[PDB]
């Protein structure tokens, strides 16, 4: 359709107005004393949230040029959420500061591309300084402190996440989902477990708990649809002679074979249970081979040149306990050599290194956890559903921040690390005067998060900013208790990855946004 | 539908208004100090661009006569993009200058057809002068300079493209795609490679890298669907006696034959890998014949009169190394006579000479690169997605400019070549006074790009243009560093093809736009 | 729906307003100094045309009585384009002049039917005078001059058309298509050629050019389906004994016969190529019989009572060379007696004389051209697409004018022939005074084209008209150089057919339009 075309300062003013609208909506939720935003939903009740990307993803304006400005600045928060899972409000605050100062410098007669180059140079130097300023985060106390800070100063969430990380291990998986009561609970599983249960209720040998218990059984791993029992007679006779229980993992067991097995169980001849293989497609084969490696067995498939009639005792894996119930199967203390397990997990790790999407990496890491580490689930408890959603979001944020701190270390929080970096970069110079102006723009915009944090508390940002800048090291301002001190001692920690990512994406979007001269959109 | 008819000066005023709207939208992005344009997208985020055709393709006007003018001038940029891939803003600037001066002459009582004829004569003479003025671009330093200038003065892109062109050769192919990191990378693959992987995971003999590696194999090229093992026993027996691996490139293999092959693999009988033939249809046959000529083998086809059971060791190709992964297959150092490869590439070159669509030519050039040269891929790295899109567009422009400069030579940049040509054409004359006026119109319009480049810098175009006109040779004006000097020494190079194409298309459209007397369009 | 009814002078002024609008849109493009008209297209870009019928076909008006007038006067241009292919602006100018003068006469109280009868009488006498005034046009110089004049004074177009007409001969056909370069080229084909290529790439015996070449082949013409080699075997063995190649033109060939033929090809047994028959249906039989009578063979069909298995060397045609490629087949120097060719072309001529649509006549003419003369194609080259379209239209107009001038002769151009005729018809009288008034109306309207040509030049039409009327013979006015002289020596020629058609159609529509008294249309 027809277009509307604007040039120069008019387009820049519309774009800045849209950016300011989105940023002012988002920045009320920053810090320990930030407040909540209510977001209307078409299908359901409103959501009360304190998360920056959640607020940013629903801001849209009726003016089309202002909406273009807002849509451009929204990508900073979206990309920060995708990268680190935290630090999105800080990214938006930095982007708005850079855009405002850059437009003010452009209107003074500077070349926008030289300003962009200066911003790029300052940001590269700042990221180098941040990496040199980081400190490792290894003890459980520091992980608890990071999880507490990220969950809006909540001691219990940090303590729970620290305990979960301690029990599960370095190669495990922790997940968050909705609970039932009013308290948080942590359920950890050791060993391997998949969401497939027994195929016949008569298999139950312990009616008290409604579960199948087997002691030191054999595991028959068959990559084949089992329908006729005639294929199953040799191994059945073998295990009957041996006298130990048998577990059959296959794609399915049909009516007559299942009937034969169940009839044989309750007569005291053989102790048999049968469950279906987990997953759909090639992943089924992968986890079948994982179980085979764990229990020291062999997968009986027709694509390798084996038939189940020829299966013998050494082809059956062995475990210590198998617990099957209506929904889950658990294999406990599988008998398998450590070398094979390490080789398999190494193969999965190098497979992880060559994965693109999040879904594949999550599945592969879950497989590594099943083979080697553990899997935990955190249940969030709240009285109402809105409180449940808000607490679940906070817990997920704390989980992400603790992970990032584990990979890349921690720096002093509260906006002090960026101030220290900007004070260190005071002698950085570029090629020409416009690049110097851009460097100064970036360095001055690095002080925005602390000023906004102090502003949300109702105090005077300039006095606090000058007092913090007058110090050195980890000297900072505690916004919760309104006192100065050492932020490392007070337990106010931020991951280096979150800070660095926020700075990088903010600069990347803002530098491009500064250079606009013309702006084209549809007519009202 | 009912129409609106407008005559003479009113029609010309509306047309010039539309042309001016589109040209002023496009011309803010010209030079080293041009800026960006934000284009609103219905599906997604806004697009920030500096490319002329991208801006031109979006402009539309609500008035209908003005929209006719804009739609008519848009074809200059479209044609320049399709022909050379670069120089669209310069073409638009030249078109607008010619249209403005020509309408000014027509309003003074000149015959538009004679003005058109004079403009065409001047443009023909100018193209001859430009061809007489160019210089070869053969060493890598000049290629780097051209790629740097065409990428908004980005040295790294120019050096990367120079290295890629050095490695991949004269007959190679270079493509640009999205990366994942923050740094650009170049990955060149030598030899022939196709994107078809192994047909069964059990074929892998190197689990550490997950690759199927074979040393000096036989290659069996079956242009048919392989159904039963029985058709293959003679070949397998011969290869097993021979004692070296065998690679089966066929249309596909089902469960039975593949099961037999895989069973034989790990038993130590014969080392065999199977992959699917690349392509779909006739191109599949062409690729199979290319592999046959490269490796020195024969394709087993029913339409030629041979069967798989009759195949011998003479119909099998040979190589030195074959590496297969989950997605790619690589044939390294095929053992074949160079004469056959030269004949095949000459035949494909002849096929190229009679190729119309660009897709077919691209596929044929990729096939020639596989046979004779290499394939290089440049992966662009950026922090966000808008930055990625801009960097990718600039890298593509630099690639096109370097190709054009290699094929046709380079002239002085900055709009200096056009000014030198116009100064050389100072005594050209036509048959009557209107033709002379048209010649002068074209000569005056040839100075527009330099004036616009100086205008975007905040300088005065008149003084700079006069000073440049006062010099001779490669003397010019550097807009980045704001000084005068030799354009060749300071590295501002422009392909002759881009300049010539821009001038030709601009004149071709502007001359016809000048001769309009009536306009017919729908009612509002 | 409800109707609106207007009576008398109101209806007549509405009609004249519509006529004036369309004619003023059209007449700006008349003469050597007429201009271009931009026509808006809903799907694509606007077209810049100088063709009168093209301008007329897109005129429609919001008012409904004015739209009736425009829709009525549009038929003159449509009919003139359909008949002669040229001279539509002149027809519209004549129609408007007649309508204006006739309405002026009617307003003075004269019977419209008598005016119509007088106009018809005058036009009949004028057409007789035009037929008597013509001179033959057979020289290549005169054909070049006609093509130059009709192509808007383009020497190259006239020269190219003259050369093409000389090469193809009297009975040949010439077509115009889009070229690829910037220069026009002429591509003439000698012999017979049809657009069917080889059925298998392995028939190629010259792979440097990728074409099949046979020297002194045998041509097997079979109007049947061939799938099994059993009915093909005896003639194949006979050809193998003969020792010379064979070309099979049939309906098509299935896999069995094609595989057999190709298998015998590269073994050196028989040099065989197979193609499909041209055409679909009865026309396919017609071209099969044409090839048979050209090469001196017999068509094998079931509907005549012959079988392929019974074929001998007598039923096989013979040629001197056959070249086949991906798309075209050419038979060079067929061995046939010219009496058969003459009889066949005579049969097709009598078929031509009894053809209603132009499409069947075009196919029959192409068949005669393939039998006797040649087929040429002119490729029009231009830089852009708008220039391409306008140049192609001009070339087609020049081709139409050249054919018409060959058919019926030439007269002096610039509107001088009509003036001479009108001067010769000064003594013509009717039955009553109103018929005499109608005759004078027609004679006055015959002077409109020269007046409009002079008006488009910026000169004063009345003085030029009187000076031309004062002369005699071919004395006229040259609007290109603004000079008087002999129109024949200056090279300004028009076909007699075009002038006669324009006059006839203009008078035919205008006479009816004069006699209106009431108009009935829908409500606005
Ligand atoms: N008690 C505190 N004193 C000072 N600063 C704090 C305190 N708690 C948190 N902060 C700072 O406030 C910021 C929290 O902002 P938040 O609302 O979580 O937005 P984001 O989505 O960017 O994390 C952190 O960067 C942290 O440095
Ligand atoms: N440093 C420089 N000094 C002077 N002129 C330059 C410099 N760099 C590029 N140019 C000129 O600017 C033009 C580049 O225009 P650009 O914005 O790339 O549009 P396009 O490539 O579409 O024509 C070229 O004609 C080139 O001669
Ligand atoms: N050099 C010339 N001097 C005078 N008359 C000319 C000249 N060239 C062409 N003409 C006249 O102009 C007319 C061409 O008008 P044109 O635009 O072709 O309209 P049409 O569609 O009726 O052919 C011809 O009738 C021809 O007699
Ligand atoms: F404006 Be061009 F695409 F460099
Ligand atoms: F306008 Be006509 F077709 F010469
Ligand atoms: K927040
Ligand atoms: K540009
Ligand atoms: K015309
Ligand atoms: Mg956080
Ligand atoms: Mg460019
Ligand atoms: Mg004409």
Short mmCIF file of C-alpha atoms in Angstrom, two decimals, chain B residues 193-201 203-204 210-212 247-253 258 273-278 322-330:
data_model
loop_
_atom_site.label_atom_id
_atom_site.label_comp_id
_atom_site.label_asym_id
_atom_site.label_seq_id
_atom_site.Cartn_x
_atom_site.Cartn_y
_atom_site.Cartn_z
CA UNK B 193 31.70 -32.95 -1.90
CA UNK B 194 27.96 -33.57 -1.78
CA UNK B 195 25.47 -33.34 1.08
CA UNK B 196 24.46 -37.01 1.37
CA UNK B 197 25.59 -38.98 4.41
CA UNK B 198 25.96 -42.61 5.40
CA UNK B 199 22.84 -44.79 5.31
CA UNK B 200 23.47 -46.62 8.59
CA UNK B 201 25.22 -45.64 11.85
CA UNK B 203 29.05 -48.19 9.08
CA UNK B 204 31.15 -45.86 11.25
CA UNK B 210 31.71 -40.14 14.14
CA UNK B 211 33.08 -40.42 10.60
CA UNK B 212 33.27 -43.25 8.09
CA UNK B 247 31.77 -47.29 -1.55
CA UNK B 248 28.28 -47.72 -3.01
CA UNK B 249 26.73 -44.52 -4.38
CA UNK B 250 23.27 -45.57 -5.54
CA UNK B 251 19.79 -44.08 -5.59
CA UNK B 252 18.86 -45.79 -2.30
CA UNK B 253 19.06 -49.11 -0.45
CA UNK B 258 21.62 -52.65 3.67
CA UNK B 273 29.85 -47.89 2.99
CA UNK B 274 26.66 -46.81 1.23
CA UNK B 275 25.37 -43.31 0.50
CA UNK B 276 22.58 -41.89 -1.64
CA UNK B 277 23.30 -40.15 -4.92
CA UNK B 278 22.88 -36.36 -4.73
CA UNK B 322 36.60 -40.96 1.29
CA UNK B 323 35.16 -39.39 4.44
CA UNK B 324 31.45 -39.62 5.26
CA UNK B 325 29.61 -37.90 8.12
CA UNK B 326 26.00 -37.60 9.24
CA UNK B 327 25.35 -35.03 6.50
CA UNK B 328 28.25 -34.80 4.00
CA UNK B 329 30.39 -37.04 1.79
CA UNK B 330 33.84 -36.06 0.53
#
